[PDB]
């Protein structure tokens, strides 16, 4: 459940927070509105475990595997299965057009999978972009009465340590790995102003990955039917924005800032970045 | 109002957050649960003014003034008009015994004052403590109707620089200016197992003051219910806690943590403590 009545944490024996010790003296922990930004260190993940368990929250994480994309789920399935909400009800949402090809993965107590079909379009770029509307089309279809939170990702990556509770917030996204270090004018977002997802050169706080976002049902649903419905004015209009769903995704995220705001600990490329010292782990990754 | 839909924010032209440069490298920023701790530097009170603004937010001052005390309620309602809540909608809630007492004080546009009129008791221990049953017996009377956020304080206190929506969140509590370096075990917390309060030596994430706690309605109403409640357990069997109705506060954050925890910045005496360097703004000071 979300925003219902929580019962008393018991007691807990734990290291005492240090006010006058930062958790990390090398990288911001919140963002300017007071969002924290989620790195190792920020968190101890027995209080949060102990806070979203008693609240019985169900996790739902949709991927889409449509058209030669289904070898990746086996990697992806298995890796989630050690790393991703591990001890939390899970309910897996693999859409594909390939709904007889999804690999039969064992998965832990408390988890389940569900394949939906959907069509594939031809090229790579709408496949993408329409998750959007699918992402959608399922809020009222299943999600609303399923999960508490949905977690959106691509599939062709690989899940290598935690990611748990510490990301459920009602709105996130992530800091893509090649631009978390950069300004905000090097920022490739949507620069023509004939598109929706258009950002001036002088606004914009991170630039948000494509690949992992997430929030509440509700949450999800306001910015995955937002982000199509932008689509589709561009479509009537002509143009595609330069990173497609990636650029709306920005867009949205500018004008209804998320509350929290995940490292790039948890969407990384390991082959083009390696492993800089401000990553103390890597989570969510690449398969190159 | 709170929780609901969310029009997106106008275009603002203000610095860019940069990830590789802590907001502050001298405290904790964020709670190990995840929570802001709020200190100047973390906050960019624009962006917060609009978000809150935009939400027609709406935020219910209380504050006893119960015998004596009617003295300190000019300079505290002169001082919140100067630094409390500017632009935002403010309903004042004067608890008082001397109802016709109350100081003509000038309020600014969209804001209003109501006097409450309840009993004195005859300890200030008492009047202290039954604050918490007379909070709750007014979130039904008023509060959830006419406010979205309360903040409850003491009233031998002056502001003397902002005090804004950047505290605002469902259940804060503020760090006490005597502990905020001290380690748990030096804490005050309530110390025997025969009183509701009982906090053991090992527990503790925070020393929270009585005199500067809120949230959303629904969770001071529950604060305020479950202390009220424990202090007549208490009392029904022979004890008071050492430290009255900021002993059971802090039973109460200890088992439902807070979701913002306001920096000593918020709750201050200049004459005991001076004016530390990690105080970058006294905000709300105690009348020496
Ligand atoms: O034939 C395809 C093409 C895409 N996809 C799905 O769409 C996702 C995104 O497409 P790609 O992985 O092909 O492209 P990128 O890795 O460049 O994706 C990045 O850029 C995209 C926009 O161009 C999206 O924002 C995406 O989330 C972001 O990680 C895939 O992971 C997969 O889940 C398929 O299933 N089949
Ligand atoms: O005769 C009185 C006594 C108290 N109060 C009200 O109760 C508040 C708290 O009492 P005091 O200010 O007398 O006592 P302290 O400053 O020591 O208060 C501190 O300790 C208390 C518990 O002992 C509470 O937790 C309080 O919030 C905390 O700041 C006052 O500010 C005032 O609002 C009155 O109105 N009249
Ligand atoms: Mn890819
Ligand atoms: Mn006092």
Redesign the pocket.
Known sequence: AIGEFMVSLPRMVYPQPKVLTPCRKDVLVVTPWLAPIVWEGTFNIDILNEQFRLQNTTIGLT???????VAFLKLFLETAEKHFMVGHRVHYYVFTDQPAAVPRVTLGTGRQLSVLEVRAYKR??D??MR?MEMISDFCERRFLSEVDYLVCV???MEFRDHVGVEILTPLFGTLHPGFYGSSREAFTYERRPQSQAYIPKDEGDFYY???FFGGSVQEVQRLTRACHQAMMVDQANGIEAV????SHLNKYLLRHKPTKVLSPEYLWDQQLLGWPAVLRKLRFTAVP
Do not use: L, N, T
């Open positions: 991927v889409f595997a449509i058209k030669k994309y790579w770029q496949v993408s998750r691509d599939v062709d990955g494509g690949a990173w497609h769903d990636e």
